A = this chain, B = another copy of it.
Amino acid sequence: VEYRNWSKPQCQITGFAPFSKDNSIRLSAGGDIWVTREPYVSCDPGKCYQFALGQGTTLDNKHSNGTVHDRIPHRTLLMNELGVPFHLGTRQVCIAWSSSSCHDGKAWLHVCITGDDKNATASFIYDGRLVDSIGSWSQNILRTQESECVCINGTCTVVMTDGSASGRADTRILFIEEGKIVHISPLSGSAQHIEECSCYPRYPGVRCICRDNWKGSNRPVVDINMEDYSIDSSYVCSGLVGDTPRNDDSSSNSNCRNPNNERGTQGVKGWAFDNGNDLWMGRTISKESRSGYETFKVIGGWSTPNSKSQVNRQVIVDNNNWSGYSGIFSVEGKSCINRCFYVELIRGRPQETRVWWTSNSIVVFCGTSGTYGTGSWPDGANINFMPI
């Protein structure tokens, strides 16, 4: 077994093809299934796994009540093979109300954060054993990506924030070797707020498209140099912006450098990736709510400030259905590195008040160099059929 380097070109793609779906909520109405949120996907060199933050309860369970709330001590990181829904034999990998995981070619790293808001602990578990930990540096909800971290030549990197969710905060980039923090770099460059980064290998570095929860409806970028630990940051050029909320397409803007101050407050975890001057990205279809999900390529979306010319759109979830978080994961093929993504499909609170819980299912698509058609792959549960 060898370390992953991801030293292959990115796969040239034409769009995305359907890959997985777990039907969690449909199943929860006739089965013992975990209440979750903040899912993601990551693969070792052989196979893929779905992850999510449990709420220490199943859905058909009185403990499901009140699970809209983000942080309790009972939240743990669930990890199954992709497509295996979160049944009672699911392994709870660690204690976490925020997490990130990645495989370095040899073993799994999990970054797991739990404890008091003002004084949380992040544990670093590598190859099944606790190797390191770090306490909160700003005493205000230490937190991380809620998607996969990225490792090159045995060094994994992960982005963490501590501080205000609606103002300047303290963001740092950790470099981790076999679970041991070997270096920490502060955020640097022009991004002014970093949450929930969706990162991906871009040899010889790592690149993240994140969420600005303060002043930007355009998505921040963080670039991580794995050779000298230097950090840069900016914003996605595309004038078709990825965050929710956001201005409609005719009145939205980005200059690649600063937050746009267009319905900038709040956000949703998301992703995009560069292809030369172009940008593949996803976002919700609704500009104000976490409804629908669409992908497309923005021509000049990486290089050209305020580009709004798109091509190769695909509906993933139609705008009559709830979406939520989305993130990227990368998969090594024979000659190139492919990009895939997942979409969290949130059911229950706050939008659907018939029930007293909040949970999600997922749908997963991968990059393709072939052809495809159309469809819509929503959660599929009838809210009226669910235990409340």
Residues of A near any B CB (own CB < 8 A): 17-23, 26-27, 29-33, 43, 46-48, 54, 56-64, 72-74, 76, 81, 83-85, 87-95, 112, 114-116, 118-121, 123-125, 127-136, 142, 178, 181, 331, 333-334, 338, 340, 363, 366-378, 380-382, 385
Contacts and interface: CB of A to CB of B under 8 A. Distances in A.
- Number of this chain's copies in the assembly equals 4
B92 A84 contact: yes
A108 to B, nearest CB: 11
9 contacts: A20-B94, A21-B76, A43-B128, A73-B375, A73-B376, A84-B90, A119-B374, A129-B333, A135-B372
Contacts of A118: 373
A26 B56 contact: yes
Given A43-B128, A114-B18, A372-B121, A83 B92 contact: yes
A373 B136 contact: yes
Given A32-B30, A84-B92, A19 B63 contact: no
B21 A92 contact: yes
A72 B381 CA distance: 12
A133 B368 contact: yes
A21 B76 CA distance: 7
A143 to B, nearest CB: 13
Which of A17, A127, A372 is packed against the most chain B CB atoms within 10 Å?
Answer: A17
Contacts of A128: 43, 46-48
- Which of A18, A20, A338 is packed against the most chain B CB atoms within 10 Å? A18
A245 to B, nearest CB: 27
Nearest to A377: B73
